[PDB]
């Protein structure tokens, strides 16, 4: 009956929902945990991040495909087809707004106010940056400028905490550098800053890789390879 019983039961459900690949339910479970205004464990914040990422990613993929079809039809000139296409895109965009706002409110009202460690604060401000960035992906006009600003400010907050609280080889720090550089490239359309961010993050980590453990060595080197991959592509 206690909140701690509820918590373990909720976390077990999320783990079931994840196994069954039913992420709508895993989101519902992990959101209930986040509402207790407590510091999440590493496991719990991971579950929550996975739950929301899968839910939003399905829509982000649907949106990209539909936009592709929309471009092709605009070139062909089929207005009636386009009326249907835009209605479809708009429906997916409404789902995107609802999902992004859902987690962003959870982050602002529950997760961030209760975060007490450097890892978790960097983690939550990075999510905030991520989900404001997803809003900016399909926003237009003023809404886009606002989403971009919210994303930038949140990533900058995450970075300010990360550079003083996490080692440069830390996977959360590296993952923050990866997504923040992608933001510079895809939202602000500043390739120079995107590269300079990726390269700096990569270089600082390579310098101190010798202190890295094992399980963190795997995750860190994998993220460093993504940073290198993005760099090679952008410099190409």
């Amino acid at each position: 009956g206690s909140t701690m019983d509820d918590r373990e039961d909720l976390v077990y459900q999320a783990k079931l929902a994840e196994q069954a690949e039913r992420y709508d339910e895993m989101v519902e479970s992990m959101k209930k945990v986040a509402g207790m205004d407590v510091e999440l464990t590493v496991e719990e914040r991971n579950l929550l991040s996975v739950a929301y990422k899968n839910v939003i990613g399905a829509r982000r993929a649907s949106w990209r495909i539909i936009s592709s079809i929309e471009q092709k039809e605009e070139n062909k000139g089929g207005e009636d087809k386009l009326k249907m296409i835009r209605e479809y895109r708009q429906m997916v965009e409404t789902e995107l707004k609802l999902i992004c706002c859902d987690i962003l409110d959870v982050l602002d009202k529950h997760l961030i106010p209760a975060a007490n460690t450097g890892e978790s604060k960097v983690f939550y401000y990075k999510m905030k940056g991520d989900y404001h960035r997803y809003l900016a992906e399909f926003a237009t006009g003023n809404d886009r400028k606002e989403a971009a600003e919210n994303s930038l400010v949140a990533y900058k907050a995450a970075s300010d905490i990360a550079m003083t609280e996490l080692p440069p080889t830390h996977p959360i720090r590296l993952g923050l550098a990866l997504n923040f550089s992608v933001f510079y490239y895809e939202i602000l359309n500043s390739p120079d800053r995107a590269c300079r961010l990726a390269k700096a993050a990569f270089d600082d980590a390579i310098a101190e890789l010798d202190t890295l453990s094992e399980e963190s060595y795997k995750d860190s080197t994998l993220i460093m390879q993504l940073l290198r991959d993005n760099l090679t592509l952008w410099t190409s």
Partner: peptide
């Protein structure tokens, strides 16, 4: 190829 953000499980 295309840009990449942090992957999820």
């Amino acid at each position: 190829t295309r840009t990449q953000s942090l992957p999820t499980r």
